[PDB]
Amino acid sequence: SEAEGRLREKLFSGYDSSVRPAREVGDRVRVSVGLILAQLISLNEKDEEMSTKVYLDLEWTDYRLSWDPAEHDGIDSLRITAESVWLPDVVLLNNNDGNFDVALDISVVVSSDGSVRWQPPGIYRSSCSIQVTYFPFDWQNCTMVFSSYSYDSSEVSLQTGLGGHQEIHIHEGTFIENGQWEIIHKPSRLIQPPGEGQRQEVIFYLIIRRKPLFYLVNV
Amino acid sequence: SEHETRLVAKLFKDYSSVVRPVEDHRQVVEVTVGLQLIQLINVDEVNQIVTTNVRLKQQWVDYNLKWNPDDYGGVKKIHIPSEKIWRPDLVLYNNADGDFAIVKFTKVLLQYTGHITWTPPAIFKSYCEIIVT
Amino acid sequence: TVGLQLIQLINVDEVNQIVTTNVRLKQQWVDYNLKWNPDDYGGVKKIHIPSEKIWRPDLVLYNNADGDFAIVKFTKVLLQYTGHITWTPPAIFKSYCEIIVTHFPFDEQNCSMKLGTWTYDGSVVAINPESDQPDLSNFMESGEWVIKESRGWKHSVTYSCCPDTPYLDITYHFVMQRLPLYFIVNVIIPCLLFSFLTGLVFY
Amino acid sequence: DIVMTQSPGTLSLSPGERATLSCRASQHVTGNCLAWYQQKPDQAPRLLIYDASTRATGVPDRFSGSGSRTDFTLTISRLEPEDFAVYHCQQYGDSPPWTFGQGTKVEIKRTVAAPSVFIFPPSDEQLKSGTASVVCLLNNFYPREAKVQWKVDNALQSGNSQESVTEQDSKDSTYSLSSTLTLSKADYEKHKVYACEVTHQGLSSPVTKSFNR
Amino acid sequence: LNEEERLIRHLFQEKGYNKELRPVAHKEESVDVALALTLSNLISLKEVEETLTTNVWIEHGWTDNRLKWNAEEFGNISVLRLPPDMVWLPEIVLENNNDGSFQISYSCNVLVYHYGFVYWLPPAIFRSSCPISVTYFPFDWQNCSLKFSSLKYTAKEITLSLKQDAKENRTYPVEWIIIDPEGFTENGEWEIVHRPARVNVDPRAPLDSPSRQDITFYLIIRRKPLFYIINILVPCVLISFMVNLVFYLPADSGEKTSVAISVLLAQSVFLLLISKRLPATSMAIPLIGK
Amino acid sequence: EVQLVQWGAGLLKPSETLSLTCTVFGGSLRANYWSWIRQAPGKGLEWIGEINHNGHTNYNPSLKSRATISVDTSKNQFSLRLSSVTAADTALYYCARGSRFFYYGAGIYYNARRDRDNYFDPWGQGTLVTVSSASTKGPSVFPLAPSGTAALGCLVKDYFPEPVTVSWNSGALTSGVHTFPAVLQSSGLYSLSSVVTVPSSSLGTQTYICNVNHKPSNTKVDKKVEP
Ligand SMILES: *[C@@H]1O[C@H](CO)[C@@H](O[C@@H]2O[C@H](CO)[C@@H](O[C@@H]3O[C@H](CO[C@H]4O[C@H](CO[C@H]5O[C@H](CO)[C@@H](O)[C@H](O)[C@@H]5O)[C@@H](O)[C@H](O[C@H]5O[C@H](CO)[C@@H](O)[C@H](O)[C@@H]5O)[C@@H]4O)[C@@H](O)[C@H](O[C@H]4O[C@H](CO)[C@@H](O)[C@H](O)[C@@H]4O)[C@@H]3O)[C@H](O)[C@H]2NC(C)=O)[C@H](O)[C@H]1NC(C)=O
Ligand SMILES: *[C@@H]1O[C@H](CO)[C@@H](O[C@@H]2O[C@H](CO)[C@@H](O)[C@H](O)[C@H]2NC(C)=O)[C@H](O)[C@H]1NC(C)=O
Ligand SMILES: CC(C)CCC[C@@H](C)[C@H]1CC[C@H]2[C@@H]3CC=C4C[C@@H](O)CC[C@]4(C)[C@H]3CC[C@]12C
Ligand SMILES: *[C@H]1O[C@H](CO)[C@@H](O)[C@H](O)[C@H]1NC(C)=O
């Protein structure tokens, strides 16, 4: 860990985590955005909001955090507390409760070439306009819109995480299936701005069908 | 960005967020305020409280946060944390059971001319007289 | 020295068996390195210091149900020139209490709060009660319960493995009596009326 | 499970010189948990270094440990007469079983010296009991490497001799060696000439000592 | 405490302790972290929300060789109490929470012994997801889990294991949730039947993933159905059986269909009562619902 | 100052059970692990096994089936039993103090663990163990007759068990004496020679007698060696 300490001291001398990494003026930071659904907690029809537990998957490159492994005892990656590095201010725009941020900052994985991977957990309450016409035999289209809150498309460019399926990742073994909802489709899409202040978005869509057995028995 | 790192170091070397950001104390800080209503979350008639999702766009000029872009490789606009600078202390007078002021301190966009645009989000739980007639 | 002041009995939850109370947790101890001579400082005999700046006992409610385990309101301490420190933080204690519902709504409960230094044993930090009873001088009247009795006991446990290391706690127990008028009026009387109406069919 | 190999095997060095002993692990030694021990003749091993760099109590400053991972080194800056012993390495960082190296002996180096060779026929007293031992002595030589061959009527023997070697002398610091050829009395009488031939780097050519029975 | 002050200054100031680095000689080494769980009390299991609320104490044990000292040189000090924010920690969190509270509640002091062993017993109130099987309600049993892992460290950096008891001539791992017979008292509605603990390792997951390793503590709990029996099932069953009396009522009474439809209304009221107590799930019809 | 004192019978016959005991002075068995280590002649150190005061044992996989290590805390002793010994078990056996063992916690959290410092700083004096089917026997002593320095000596042949002592001229002659390490023959008996170099001019004038002693047979021989 002494070699790791030396590398950490070298990397963060003169490093400003509040400054976006752009080697030249006009350079854009590509941020790949993906999502893993750990649990579809609920879809509250009264409040019209979907509660989910997820892991984001954000990937970018920071040229300032590069090094030669041969000069640092063969160390080719690092785990660093997320607050110590620049982060893209990617938030859930369509949150319903007022919480924009991730549940826990945890750590980033920084490779020797400057690649940064961040997989923070998140408990999100997103607004979902309920289509009530065919309730309880209905299906819903609940979206999760992720975007930078501050940086515009000229500074931070977004792309769907893949490496390539444009979908929400669900682990077949560990996923907590909801007893009232079946996931039909789970795509993701990059939305360009119309036509600076213009901003791209990455929307993860959950098309879900209610399982109405309860209402068949009790009503 | 080495240029932006140097600029950010220079701007906050001798900066004070306490005093109003004017060259002369007899000047008035001009703040442009705009309210964007994103969502009408709830209208609780029993307790007479309206919950809304809003963005509170505030624009002003900080005299001391200026730079020549030619001295910093052509950097013309930056994003900085809002907690480091003087801000106007907007408060919702008729707050019922929410926050009086902004609590979500998002970044400000700062131009080289000193123009600041800060667009924080908020959940306004305001008090409304509900006529039930 | 540890003393408990019960300000209010906020609620008794018989379902989850939780008693929520508002308390002040008076703690007194001497700090050896925080002494001074007042004559050298203009006669200043006492000062007020943030509690986060000094060592404190790590008192924990051992029988916490679902609230806070330790003090979270770090109010200022009163420090005397002799090094004596008085710290009286407020807290809301949510403590487990085994609720016996046999005689409900005419039941009597015995709810306790066990307090101790979490990480220090009796050979490094010793706790003593301030008084034999909780301080009830500033207790707000409850519209649902009457506190019949209250008493604080210090306990010291030595395990056979470690005969030189006592583990200490102070347990404050409250024997409380429910006021049954609400259940008498709202529940018992209607049931009695239905029971009386049951027999009228036979006439 | 972890095999430890000490590389030098034998280190012939003069007093006042610098000694470097190597220990190699077949697997990563966790936490640099390596110990170095010294063992003099007719004595138990004595702990010299532990944790790969930390001197034990009463260990002079001349001994120093270094290295990591799978390569470890013990360095003696200035060699004294009391430092000529057998040195062992041991690993203790990866749960039992605890394993040692095979050991590395540090010998004293002196001017190359040739053996003086002597041959001894069996005594009449031994022949009376039915056996014959023929003894070849190589006296006061250095270095230790030497070869002895037995010839019986110019026919090379094999399998019927045993060697013994002394330690290095306390003063001259040299070695002596005996080779003993054992034959039945009946076989001994079947031949005339008994010879031992000795090769050593201090000899310009092999030396033979012989007798006629 | 001249000696404790001197020892802390020696360990942290003089030797330059860095809590951001793991306690290893080389980066490729992993830190052994032993975990055990003590169930102080099972607060509740909410069926509609499918959430288990527990009070647990998480016993952590690991080794930090940078925090080693020879006790005789420091007044025979053998153990130190230190704030957890001064030392490196293994960032163990509850993975399967459903409220966003991943971490322990009270960050108590660490006990650091002179041989480098770090002992840490933080308590926590956890709210975890527990999907509910309503098939035999109110005679149902549930299977809840508490999955502990690290998101800041992977299997490459820390190796999670269960507490190893070594007080006897044979060591063994503690493969159950610890329940103190003196400090524990059963939940009013749930009785613990089994309480195992397991180290789960995913063979397919990569070593550098946080999902490679976890330690899971399970609670098999049986509902105590006396409340539901007394207050729902006996009235409902008796009222339903009461409808058979109409066949013994003469047709001249003019009160048969009134009795029958009133029984139906009472059953409807009972269904209204029960609809508010269970989740609206589709795996099965509850026994009371059946 | 911890001291380890070993005892036990070093002379055993094939298929028997070696039994050794190590006693600790100046310290208790509670604080440490305690190990047995064997060193064969011309071979590296080999760890046999270890035990703590609770009786928890670890063994070398190559000796686990035959080695049993026990502890007795009342006498502050620990013992090794090696079953079915062969000639391959002839070695110098040591007892030594291993890693520190510590207790921590209280109540249900009371536990113990070992430190990661299993190096052997204190050692026992060592016990030589020889496994032979041979029987106590005394040597025959034969002259190695001298043929400007001469060599002469004595051949000390066919004895058991070690050791023999050899002196010259009742200890008055020490300069130039070499007494060789014994060799074990296939018969199972030991042989050695002792030699001395002397001026060839002294061969007529000076008497040379080798004094051989083998205590197990009370062999005492004074052999005059002459040309
Ligand atoms: C509602 O519920 C609460 C419980 O939550 C209940 O509270 C109990 O109240 C009773 C009183 O009615 C308490 O009983 C008393 O406890 C006193 C304190 O006991 C502790 O301290 C003792 C003193 O320790 C010091 O001195 C001893 C030598 O004397 C020394 O060895 C120690 O090291 C130390 O210096 C200690 O001896 C005692 O230990 C006993 O108990 C423990 C626990 O059972 C046991 O493990 C030990 O082996 C030993 O037996 C303990 O640590 C105590 O002083 C007091 O004694 C008086 O009464 C007894 C009556 O038998 C006389 O014999 C004695 O001479 C004294 O006159 C008495 O025992 C009880 O402890 C409370 N429980 C708790 C947990 O707080 C309420 O009563 C309930 N209310 C209702 C139902 O109305
Ligand atoms: C370790 O201790 C256990 C418990 O004493 C030993 O197991 C017992 O051994 C005796 C032999 O005399 C049996 O009679 C018992 O039935 C065993 N079990 C119990 C529960 O006592 C075990 O043999 C010990 N191990 C060693 C190698 O000494
Ligand atoms: C007509 C009478 C019997 C009233 C109707 C009783 C009905 C509701 C039945 C259905 C399931 C039954 C319960 C199932 C299991 C047991 C066994 C034992 O633990 C005591 C009784 C108890 C708890 C039963 C009590 C009666 C019970 C609740
Ligand atoms: C530690 O050091 C002190 C002072 O030398 C000594 O009195 C004491 O016996 C030692 N051991 C213990 C366990 O206190």
Coordinates of N, CA, C and O and ligand atoms in Angstrom, one line a residue, chain C residues 108-114 149 151-158 166-175, chain E residues 182, ligand 1:
Chain C
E108 N -51.3 -2.7 33.6 CA -50.1 -2.0 34.1 C -48.9 -2.5 33.5 O -48.7 -3.7 33.3
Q109 N -48.0 -1.6 33.1 CA -46.7 -2.0 32.3 C -45.5 -1.6 33.2 O -45.7 -0.9 34.1
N110 N -44.4 -2.2 32.8 CA -43.1 -1.9 33.5 C -42.0 -1.7 32.4 O -41.4 -2.7 32.0
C111 N -41.9 -0.5 32.0 CA -41.0 -0.2 30.8 C -39.6 0.4 31.3 O -39.6 1.3 32.0
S112 N -38.5 -0.2 30.8 CA -37.2 0.1 31.3 C -36.3 0.7 30.2 O -36.6 0.5 29.0
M113 N -35.3 1.5 30.6 CA -34.3 2.1 29.7 C -32.9 1.7 30.3 O -32.6 2.2 31.4
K114 N -32.2 0.9 29.6 CA -30.9 0.4 30.1 C -29.8 1.2 29.3 O -29.8 1.2 28.1
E149 N -44.7 4.4 39.6 CA -43.4 4.3 40.3 C -42.3 4.5 39.2 O -42.4 4.2 38.1
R151 N -37.7 4.2 39.2 CA -36.5 3.9 40.0 C -35.3 3.5 39.1 O -35.5 2.7 38.2
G152 N -34.2 4.0 39.4 CA -32.9 3.7 38.7 C -32.0 2.8 39.5 O -31.8 3.1 40.7
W153 N -31.5 1.8 38.9 CA -30.6 0.8 39.6 C -29.4 0.6 38.7 O -29.4 0.5 37.5
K154 N -28.2 0.7 39.4 CA -26.9 0.3 38.8 C -26.7 -1.1 38.9 O -26.9 -1.7 40.0
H155 N -26.2 -1.7 37.8 CA -25.8 -3.2 37.8 C -24.4 -3.3 37.3 O -24.0 -2.6 36.4
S156 N -23.7 -4.2 37.9 CA -22.3 -4.5 37.5 C -22.2 -6.0 37.3 O -22.6 -6.8 38.2
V157 N -21.7 -6.5 36.1 CA -21.6 -7.9 35.7 C -20.2 -8.2 35.5 O -19.5 -7.5 34.7
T158 N -19.7 -9.2 36.2 CA -18.3 -9.7 35.9 C -18.5 -11.1 35.4 O -19.1 -12.0 36.0
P166 N -15.3 -5.5 35.1 CA -16.7 -5.3 35.3 C -17.4 -4.5 34.1 O -16.8 -3.6 33.6
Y167 N -18.6 -4.9 33.8 CA -19.4 -4.2 32.8 C -20.6 -3.7 33.5 O -21.3 -4.4 34.1
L168 N -20.8 -2.3 33.3 CA -21.7 -1.6 34.1 C -22.9 -1.1 33.3 O -22.8 -0.9 32.1
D169 N -24.0 -1.0 33.9 CA -25.2 -0.3 33.3 C -26.0 0.3 34.4 O -25.9 0.0 35.5
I170 N -26.8 1.3 33.9 CA -27.9 1.9 34.8 C -29.2 1.7 34.1 O -29.4 2.1 32.9
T171 N -30.1 1.1 34.8 CA -31.5 0.8 34.2 C -32.5 1.6 35.0 O -32.6 1.5 36.2
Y172 N -33.2 2.5 34.3 CA -34.3 3.3 34.8 C -35.6 2.6 34.4 O -35.9 2.5 33.2
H173 N -36.4 2.1 35.4 CA -37.7 1.5 35.1 C -38.8 2.4 35.6 O -38.7 3.1 36.6
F174 N -39.9 2.3 34.8 CA -41.1 3.1 35.1 C -42.3 2.1 35.2 O -42.5 1.4 34.2
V175 N -43.0 2.0 36.3 CA -44.2 1.3 36.4 C -45.4 2.3 36.2 O -45.5 3.3 36.9
Chain E
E182 N -30.4 -13.5 27.5 CA -30.7 -12.6 28.5 C -31.2 -11.2 27.9 O -32.1 -10.6 28.5
Ligands
LIG1 C1 -40.0 -3.3 37.0 O1 -38.9 -3.9 36.3 C2 -37.6 -3.6 36.8 C3 -36.6 -4.3 36.0 O2 -36.4 -3.6 34.7 C4 -37.5 -3.9 38.3 O3 -36.2 -3.4 38.8 C5 -35.7 -4.3 39.8 O4 -35.9 -3.8 41.0 C6 -35.3 -4.6 42.1 C7 -35.7 -3.9 43.4 O5 -37.1 -4.2 43.7 C8 -33.8 -4.6 41.9 O6 -33.2 -5.4 42.9 C9 -32.3 -4.6 43.7 O7 -31.0 -4.4 42.9 C10 -30.0 -3.7 43.6 C11 -28.9 -3.6 42.7 O8 -28.4 -4.9 42.4 C12 -27.2 -4.8 41.6 O9 -26.1 -4.2 42.4 C13 -25.7 -4.9 43.6 C14 -24.6 -4.1 44.2 O10 -23.4 -4.2 43.5 C15 -22.3 -3.8 44.3 O11 -22.2 -4.4 45.6 C16 -21.9 -5.8 45.6 C17 -21.8 -6.3 47.0 O12 -23.0 -6.0 47.7 C18 -20.6 -6.1 44.8 O13 -20.5 -7.5 44.7 C19 -20.7 -5.5 43.4 O14 -19.5 -5.7 42.7 C20 -21.0 -4.0 43.5 O15 -19.9 -3.4 44.1 C21 -25.3 -6.3 43.2 O16 -25.0 -7.0 44.3 C22 -26.4 -7.0 42.4 O17 -26.0 -8.3 41.9 C23 -27.0 -9.2 42.2 O18 -28.0 -9.3 41.2 C24 -27.4 -9.7 39.9 C25 -28.6 -9.7 38.9 O19 -29.6 -10.6 39.3 C26 -26.8 -11.1 40.1 O20 -26.2 -11.5 38.8 C27 -25.8 -11.1 41.2 O21 -25.2 -12.4 41.4 C28 -26.4 -10.6 42.4 O22 -27.4 -11.5 42.9 C29 -26.8 -6.1 41.2 O23 -25.7 -6.1 40.2 C30 -29.7 -4.4 45.0 O24 -28.8 -3.6 45.7 C31 -31.0 -4.6 45.8 O25 -30.7 -5.3 47.0 C32 -31.6 -5.0 48.0 O26 -32.7 -5.9 48.0 C33 -32.3 -7.3 48.1 C34 -33.6 -8.1 48.0 O27 -33.4 -9.4 47.8 C35 -31.6 -7.5 49.5 O28 -31.2 -8.8 49.6 C36 -30.4 -6.6 49.5 O29 -29.8 -6.7 50.8 C37 -30.9 -5.1 49.3 O30 -31.7 -4.7 50.4 C38 -32.0 -5.3 45.0 O31 -31.6 -6.7 44.7 C39 -33.5 -5.3 40.5 O32 -32.1 -5.4 40.3 C40 -34.2 -4.4 39.5 N1 -33.9 -4.9 38.1 C41 -33.4 -4.2 37.2 C42 -32.9 -4.9 35.9 O33 -33.2 -3.0 37.2 C43 -38.6 -3.3 39.1 O34 -38.6 -3.8 40.5 C44 -40.0 -3.7 38.5 N2 -41.1 -3.0 39.2 C45 -42.1 -3.6 39.7 C46 -42.3 -5.1 39.3 O35 -42.9 -3.1 40.4

